[PDB]
Each structure stands twice: as C-alpha cells, then as structure tokens.
C-alpha cells in the first residue's frame, strides 16, 4: 500500500497472467480477480520463477477433488487433518507441485485456517518448486523450532515446518497489518523471509 509502486504491481499482474488459470463455466469473476490482486503482492522474483517453471494457479468453482487431476485424493486424509473426519474432498486449497484453489474461500475460516487461502497455497509452490524445499532445511528447522507455535494452530503450524513456512509467507505478503504482526510474533522468521526476497 506504499511499498510497491504501480509499475511493479502491473508487472506482477502481467506475470500472473501467465500463471493463473480461470475455470471453465460459471464462476465469480470479481472474486477471482480479487484473488489475483492479492497474489500480485508477492515479490515479483517469486512470480517470475513460478512462470518459468510453468506452475499454474488453478482457480476453481467447485471441490478440488471434482477436478480430474485431483480425483485420486478422494477419501485421502490430508496431513494435519487427522481426526477431523474430513478428507481432501473438504479442503479448499492445495499447494506444492501444483496449486488449486476454490474461489470464495480466501478468508480465514472458510473451511481452512490460513490467513489467506491463495497466498498460503502459493507459498507451498514457492517453497517446493522455486526454493527446493527450503522449509525443510536445517536453517529453517531451527527458526521453526523457536517460532513455529507463535502463529497459533500449534498442532499444524507448530508440527510441520512447511506449514509454518507457508503461513508465515502468507502473513508477510497479505497486507501491511499481517506483515507487522509477523514481525512482532516471529522476528527470526520475518528476517528470514526478508532476506530470501533480497
């Protein structure tokens, strides 16, 4: 809101035009556009790397497992969703070697606990594809051991370093308030993310 100029925002939207895929059929076009605008706050260096790797951010109008490429996850219990009685059929956002996201489910509490669905999922793709699983490196493990319970959801974020990475990334990039909150709660994580983007 003062840290990225109009030219850089437009460049990031242009990069995202070669990443984001809108679904076939009816969907909420305004909310899909809002998701793209939130994604455009991610540092352009990461967006450029996603584009070069041909990573697509698939926006969906239905359940993830109703897509042919995720049908294999029907009935599978996601990591961290044990005991919920729920499976991938119920999950609104996926990230890793692909990214798939239900339009309308961005906000925290819409079937998931992330501060923002699309930034959290895209962070997983950046971790895995762009940064070669940096969340599982020794350096990040040590930061996670200290700070990984300081964003809440201790049995998920505090247990899986890749989840703490993805959520911290989402705080860093969503808006000025979540960025400030991360700096206060998780100062080593904040510095780690700042240095990754240098």
């Amino acid at each position: 809101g003062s840290h990225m100029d109009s030219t850089t925002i437009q460049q990031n939207k242009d990069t995202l035009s070669q990443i984001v895929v809108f679904p076939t059929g009816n969907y909420d076009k305004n909310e899909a556009n809002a998701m793209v605008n939130r994604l455009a706050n991610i540092d352009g260096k990461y967006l450029n790397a996603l584009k070069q790797n041909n990573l697509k951010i698939k926006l969906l109008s239905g359940k993830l497992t109703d897509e042919k490429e995720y049908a294999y996850l029907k009935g599978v219990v996601p990591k961290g969703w044990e005991g919920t009685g729920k499976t991938w059929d119920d999950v609104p956002g996926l990230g890793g070697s692909t990214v798939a996201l239900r339009i309308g489910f961005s906000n925290k509490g819409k079937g998931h606990d992330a501060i923002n669905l699309e930034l959290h999922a895209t962070a997983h793709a950046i971790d895995h594809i762009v940064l070669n699983d940096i969340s599982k490196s020794a350096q990040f493990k040590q930061i996670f051991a200290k700070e990984g319970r300081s964003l809440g959801n201790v049995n998920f974020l505090g247990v899986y370093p890749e989840e703490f990475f993805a959520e911290s990334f989402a705080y860093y990039y969503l808006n000025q308030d979540t960025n400030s909150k991360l700096k206060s709660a998780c100062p080593q994580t904040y510095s780690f993310l700042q240095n990754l983007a240098k």
Partner: peptide, 4 residues
Amino acid sequence: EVNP
C-alpha cells in the same frame, strides 16, 4: 507434492 500436495499440502493443505
């Protein structure tokens, strides 16, 4: 790789 997949993650919720």
